[PDB]
């Protein structure tokens, strides 16, 4: 009478009641034993997520879980036999919930204002761009965001002028040649990708003034 | 001993919104040994639960996967009451609408309904 | 979710006959059952809870025995005011009921 963790995906379709792990006291050998949860997401708030079949020990979700509401779920199995004396100490019950990409990612700004010197060489920092995203970033993809420049405006002298970090979003100097009386002003389209480029995009503009030597 | 009243309109036209409340007297919506819930009852589907709402450290609700999209229930702690709110309504909404407290957390049954109230959705 | 289907949809009893009204849940609940009492333009009545504990105030002619996946209820003496539906009601994942037994009176 032990169990292992319990992992389900978040945003499940069941069907419900959907069963996870049967609960079994080797001293059904003998006698019929009647399983019962306590704990928060049990009996306790937020109550009836889980319940257990009594006569047969099967724990049932009864739900769709939510990671970013309740990431996991700590219950207690319990098993006595018919005379209410327990046949079993209390068994930890862990329930992990893992993540499913739910969240898009989001700039932290819908316009970044930067600026850089027009005598500057390939490799100078410009300005830093943020987005975050709610999803698991440590065991998943789905938080973690790819950055990436769209378009340029305008393309004078030429398209790839600047580049940007694809995890910091540090915006840098690709090509040097930059005059505050040619070109004064760059409208940067600049897009965030969770699940490192393979998932939903979001679009900001990056501002970049170009500053008289 | 406890008792729950209700009030609202039963005629509701398509796609607008039902709107029922449920008036405790004898006890609290806040109180901590208690969950407040909305019943329907059609000649079609029968008797089906709804949702529910709670008050423990905090407010919690719970609702029917069938209705999870259109529902709301909130409590009122000043006027000692929780109402029903139910958006896109279409014919099948057609029921005879139930408050009811479950002892607890619902795991005991039933025992204390309101009177109902008949909702008829059409143009 | 759990279906709960009653049998028979309907019954024709006297006054003193013993009657049983049966409920099966589409998969094992064990004990969390209700039945209730219903009389025309009425709420539902809460008469058991636990498949066998009866409600405070019901009377003792009221019964409920199974478990798992089968219920029964029973009135032992059949009484003018027991003509009615009555529903059955699981609540081991969320709460659903059964789609009543009418009882009526035979004559």
């Known amino acids: 009478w032990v169990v292992a963790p319990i992992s389900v995906p978040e945003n499940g379709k069941g069907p419900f009641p959907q069963r996870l792990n049967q609960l079994k006291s080797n001293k059904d050998r003998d006698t019929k034993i009647f399983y019962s949860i306590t704990g928060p997401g049990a009996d306790s708030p937020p109550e009836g997520v889980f319940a257990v079949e009594k006569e047969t020990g099967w724990l049932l979700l009864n739900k769709p879980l939510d990671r970013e509401e309740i990431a996991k779920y700590e219950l207690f199995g319990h098993a006595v036999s018919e005379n209410g004396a327990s046949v079993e100490d209390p068994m930890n019950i862990s329930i992990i919930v893992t993540d499913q990409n739910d969240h898009k990612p989001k700039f932290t700004q819908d316009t970044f204002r930067g600026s850089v010197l027009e005598g500057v060489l390939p490799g100078t920092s410009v300005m830093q761009v943020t987005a975050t995203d709610e999803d698991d970033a440590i065991y998943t993809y789905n938080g973690v965001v790819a950055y990436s420049i769209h378009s340029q405006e305008p393309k004078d002298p030429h398209d790839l002028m600047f580049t940007i970090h694809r995890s910091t979003g540090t915006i840098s100097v690709i090509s040097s040649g930059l005059d505050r009386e040619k070109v004064p002003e760059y409208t940067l389209t600049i897009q965030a990708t969770d699940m490192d480029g393979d998932g939903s995009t979001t679009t900001a503009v990056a501002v970049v003034e170009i500053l008289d030597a | 001993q406890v008792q729950l009243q209700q009030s609202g309109p039963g005629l509701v036209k398509p796609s607008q919104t039902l709107s029922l409340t449920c008036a405790i007297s004898?006890?609290?919506?806040?109180?901590?040994?208690?969950?407040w819930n909305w019943i329907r009852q059609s000649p079609s589907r029968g008797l089906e639960w709804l949702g529910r709402?709670?008050?423990?450290?905090?407010?919690?609700?719970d609702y029917a996967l069938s209705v999870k999209s259109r529902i709301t229930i909130n409590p009122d702690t000043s006027k000692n009451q929780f109402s029903l709110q139910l958006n896109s309504v279409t014919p099948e909404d057609t029921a005879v609408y139930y408050c009811?407290?479950?002892?607890?957390?619902?795991?005991?049954?039933?025992?204390?309904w309101g009177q109902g109230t008949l909702v008829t959705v059409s143009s | 979710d759990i279906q709960m289907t009653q049998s028979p949809s309907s019954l024709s009893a006297s006054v003193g006959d013993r009657v049983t009204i049966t409920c099966r849940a589409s998969?094992?609940?064990?004990?969390?059952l209700a039945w209730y009492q219903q009389k025309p333009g009425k709420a539902p009545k809460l008469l058991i809870y636990?498949?066998?504990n009866l409600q405070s105030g019901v009377p003792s002619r009221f019964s409920g025995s199974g478990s798992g996946t089968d219920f029964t209820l029973t009135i032992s003496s059949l009484q003018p005011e027991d003509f009615a539906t009555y529903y059955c009601q699981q609540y081991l994942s969320w709460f659903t009921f059964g789609q009543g037994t009418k009882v009526e009176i035979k004559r």
């Open positions: 009811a407290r479950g002892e607890g957390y619902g795991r005991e049954g039933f025992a204390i």
């Open positions: 709402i709670y008050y423990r450290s905090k407010w919690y609700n």
């Open positions: 004898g006890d609290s919506v806040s109180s901590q040994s208690a969950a």
């Open positions: 636990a498949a066998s």
């Open positions: 998969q094992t609940i064990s004990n969390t």
